Write a protein that binds this ligand. Structure first.
Ligand SMILES: CCCCCCCCOCCOCCOCCOCCO
Ligand SMILES: CCCCCCCCOCCOCCOCCOCCO
Lengths: 758, 150
């Protein structure tokens, strides 16, 4: 619906001609039945007196005009008095009162013991003295009671001895303020500020309450400080009961020509629970430093920054924020600066990490890492590319070996196209040099033979090609068939003397089947000798809109992909043949509803690698439902992730069903539900139930979230730890408005958020 | 033995096109103009007459990385990435035509070798851009057939 229109029902519409300017110099029209005395001195109108002046529409029973000398210079003191039944109306606010007064030169109007109601926008009240001074800019209220929600139920109201509504500065100042939820007062303050406008807040202070199982009773009262119309800060005292103390959260948004950015800094001086769990030292302070930055200077310069650092590896597990959650397994600390033009681009960056584990944080870090690309799209029929990289890798642990890698990779391409299809021949070269150090210490432990000066040269030959066919269907629908084939060959090179720094197994999507890489980075390159064949059938309608599509792929191997250190734990020992299979699909049906699917299968695992399927009923903007499902076989986990399969929590793999419900029961309350459930251990991993009360001038929301957090050791093998979380949040709004709802906001908040899958 | 050449031959009206964007050096922009170069489309700047020649304006892109699934300990199993791209076709005298596309992928996470998983991630992003560009090109005939008399 358009609730705004519903809230504009009680609010007057105001007709009348809109006069541009001020009704001060404009003449005064007086129409009544009765009118005695001296007109420019002591005038007395009676009997349905109607006085108009530009936008000033006044109607009363008796009106008196009493003047002063105003001699010499210059104007007349035009002083208009009003005895009884004064009904004033204009383009801004309707006033009703017994006794009134008005000076039309300075446009200063006074009304004693009257009631007021805004026009065009919500806002009413009753005051002992209602005044419009300062050329109808400053709205002074002596002994005033103000409220926004007009009829039905006296739900809330603010009373004050001295209230001031400024229109230019756009603000409602209140002296001796008292807030009421009807007839029962709660808070009293010597002074308060209620903003009417938008930019540059410094609004009083709006708090929020929570109730978690780990922190207990949580109470946040975040301070807001706007410095300048580009950057500002946001402090946040966050009282925690079980933790026993106030956690200070320092936000800082900024926006400069060098780019935008955000700086968060949470801090907790003393933690009792963390002290009891870890009494190795008296130091029990827990903090979080976050810094993000995104900048594009002169379209050619690119300055990006993603820095995230915590104090203890168990921070995000306990404390929850918009910067991390219990699902995070490590912290990312990357800085990136690059010059990207058009045919050339050189980006240098430093990558560091922070693994969230008590004793297994042997993660590497690039320091620095230089990337360079140089293109040439026209060398006759050919188009050439040049890639270069220099990366110095180090490790936090001084036991692990260090390295200095210099990679060079030229790529010559030859595109051919005619009409029914196309064929592209790509010949690439992969040269690489390694200067490794601190090897003697790691030469022990396990079977390793890493040398200081290593080199590697691997050529690559690839031939891609795809065709396009058409088959006409019924009632305007048009089907098309896209067959695709790509051969790849790379000779074998023994890489047992080369360490692993940025190489891991990938996932084989339908498009990923046509990828000339087996691992990530440039450390482990497989001996390619394969042919990839895939089919892509698509279904369009009469409006040339893709409604349906389906793809199925198959990779055939002539010889096994060897690197020289293939320590992959496969189920069987199949080396050749069609090992890798894939299949994606997408359905749209109508304007609403839809379907999505993706399946990856491998014969060496004797079971499907991955399997995801997501269906969704989406309207257009809000109120929607989603149902998803994901599966990852134990063999996949065993082969791709070693040592993880040894544990009991990563052994069974993945097999979960996701639920997301969001359909409004009443045209006021917003119902929100979610349910992620595992089928392997038949236990509910996550679930969320939230509700909201959107009246018109205020809104309270209650959220419930039960989720899996950590793993419980010992016991009878071990089980999953469960954590519940209640949340009471209150937002006023309705003033500057453009809020309320929540629609889907409440959905994205769990450890497994709701994504828009159409 | 059915007729070949499908998905509607890239409109001869838009055989030569102008590309507009806030960040022409961005990955999305370069992937788009490269995908245009692939389909045999001429790219000319907006410094000429520009009367019959339409244009393609890139509104903005947005990549969303959320947790798709988790293990039994609460830690992330695999992340699902969603690249949302907004665009608009501007034909001189035929108003505008909005084009919204989305790319969906996913990949497993490994803290131990985060760095590797970072590189991989970047690679994924690149591909997700390219495919996005493809998804932008295939939705052009809809804009072509949108030009109706009323
Ligand atoms: C029984 C007939 C209704 C009785 C009055 C109707 C005629 C209205 O005449 C009122 C005359 O007063 C007009 C005052 O003019 C105000 C503006 O001029 C004063 C300064 O410019
Ligand atoms: C989206 C925040 C909630 C909305 C209320 C605050 C208003 C939104 O903008 C505040 C932050 O944006 C910074 C303003 O942009 C800088 C403008 O001046 C820069 C030109 O030098």
């Amino acid at each position: 619906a358009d609730l705004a229109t519903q809230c504009m029902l009680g609010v007057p519409s105001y007709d009348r001609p809109l006069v541009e300017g001020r009704p001060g110099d404009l003449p005064v029209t007086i129409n009544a039945d009765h009118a005695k005395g001296n007109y420019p001195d002591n005038a007395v109108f009676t009997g349905n007196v109607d006085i108009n002046q530009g936008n000033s529409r006044l109607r009363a029973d008796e009106v008196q005009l009493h003047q002063q000398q105003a001699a010499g210079q210059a104007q007349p003191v035009r002083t208009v008095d009003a005895l009884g039944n004064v009904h004033y109306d204009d383009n801004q606010v309707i006033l009703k009162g017994p006794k009134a007064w008005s000076n039309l030169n300075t446009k200063d109007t006074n009304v004693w013991q009257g009631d007021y109601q805004m026009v065009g926008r919500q806002g009413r009240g009753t005051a002992d003295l209602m005044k419009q001074r300062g050329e109808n800019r400053y709205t002074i209220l002596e002994n005033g009671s103000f409220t926004s929600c007009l009829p039905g139920s006296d739900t809330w109201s603010v009373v004050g001895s001295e209230v001031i509504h400024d229109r230019e500065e756009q603000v409602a100042e209140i002296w001796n303020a008292r807030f009421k939820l009807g007839s029962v007062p709660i808070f009293y303050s010597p002074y308060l500020q209620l903003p009417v406008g938008d930019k540059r807040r410094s609004g009083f202070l709006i708090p929020n309450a929570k109730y978690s199982t780990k922190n207990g009773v949580e109470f946040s009262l975040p301070y807001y400080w706007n410095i300048a119309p580009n950057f500002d800060a946001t402090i946040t005292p966050h009282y925690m009961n079980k933790r026993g103390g106030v956690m200070w959260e320092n936000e800082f948004r900024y926006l400069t020509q060098l780019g935008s950015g955000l700086t968060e800094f949470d801090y907790l001086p003393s933690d009792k629970v963390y002290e009891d769990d870890h009494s190795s030292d008296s130091n029990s302070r827990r903090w979080l430093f976050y810094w993000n930055h995104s900048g594009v200077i002169d379209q050619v310069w690119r300055l990006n920054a993603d820095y995230t650092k915590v104090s203890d590896p168990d921070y995000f597990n306990d404390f929850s924020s918009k910067y991390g959650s219990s699902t995070d397994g490590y912290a990312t600390q990357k800085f990136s600066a690059g010059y990207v033009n058009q045919n050339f681009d050189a980006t240098v960056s430093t990558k560091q990490f922070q693994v969230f584990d008590r004793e297994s944080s042997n993660s590497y870090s690039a320091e620095p890492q230089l990337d360079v690309n140089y293109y040439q799209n026209d060398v006759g029929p050919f188009d050439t590319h040049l890639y270069g990289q220099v990366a110095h890798f180090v490790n936090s642990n001084n036991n692990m070996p260090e390295a200095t890698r210099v990679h060079f990779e030229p790529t010559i391409n030859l595109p051919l196209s005619n009409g029914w299809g196309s064929l592209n021949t790509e010949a690439k070269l992969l040269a690489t040099h390694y200067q490794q150090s601190n090897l003697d210490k790691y030469n022990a432990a396990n079977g390793t033979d890493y040398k200081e000066s290593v080199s590697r040269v691997m050529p690559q030959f690839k031939v891609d090609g795809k065709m396009v066919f058409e088959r006409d269907l019924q009632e305007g629908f048009t089907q098309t068939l896209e067959p695709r084939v790509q051969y790849l060959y790379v000779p074998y090179r023994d890489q047992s003397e080369i360490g692993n720094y940025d190489s891991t197994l990938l996932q084989s999507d339908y498009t990923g089947l046509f990828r000339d890489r087996t691992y990530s980075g440039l450390d482990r390159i497989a001996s390619a000798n394969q042919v990839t064949t895939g089919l892509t059938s698509r279904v369009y309608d009469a409006a040339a809109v893709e409604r349906f599509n389906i793809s199925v792929g198959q990779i055939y191997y002539f010889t096994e992909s060897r690197t020289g250190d293939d320590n992959i734990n496969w189920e069987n020992n199949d080396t050749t043949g069609s090992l890798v299979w894939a299949g994606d699909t997408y359905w749209r049906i109508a304007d609403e509803w839809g379907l999505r699917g993706g399946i990856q299968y491998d014969t060496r695992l004797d079971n499907v690698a991955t399997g995801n399927g997501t269906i969704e009923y989406r309207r257009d903007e809000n109120r929607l439902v989603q149902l998803n499902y994901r599966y990852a076989s134990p063999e996949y986990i065993q082969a791709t992730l070693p040592s993880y399969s040894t544990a009991a929590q990563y052994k069974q793999g993945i097999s979960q069903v996701g639920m997301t419900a969001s359909w409004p029961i009443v045209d006021r309350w917003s119902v929100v539900g979610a349910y992620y459930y595992d089928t392997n251990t038949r236990k509910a991993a996550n679930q969320m139930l939230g509700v909201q009360y959107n009246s018109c001038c205020y809104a309270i929301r209650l959220g419930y979230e039960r989720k899996v957090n950590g793993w419980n050791s010992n016991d009878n093998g071990g089980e999953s730890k469960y954590d519940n979380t209640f949340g009471i949040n209150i937002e006023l709004r309705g003033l500057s408005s453009n809020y309320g709802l929540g629609t889907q906001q409440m959905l994205r908040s769990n450890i497994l958020p709701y994504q828009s899958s159409l | 033995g059915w007729h070949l050449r499908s998905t509607t031959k890239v409109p001869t009206t838009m055989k030569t096109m102008i590309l507009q964007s806030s960040d022409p050096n961005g990955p999305l922009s370069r992937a788009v103009r490269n995908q245009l170069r692939l389909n045999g489309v001429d790219l000319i700047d907006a410094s000429t007459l520009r009367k019959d020649v339409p244009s393609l304006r890139l509104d903005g892109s947005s990549i969303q990385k959320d947790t798709a699934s988790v293990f039994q300990d609460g830690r992330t199993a695999e992340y699902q990435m969603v690249m949302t791209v907004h665009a608009s076709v501007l034909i001189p005298g035929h108003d505008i035509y909005p084009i919204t596309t989305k790319v969906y992928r996913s990949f497993f996470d490994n803290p131990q070798a985060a760095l590797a998983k970072d590189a991989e991630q970047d690679m994924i992003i690149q591909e997700m851009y390219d495919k996005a560009a493809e998804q932008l090109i295939r939705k052009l005939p809809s804009v072509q057939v949108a030009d109706v008399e009323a």
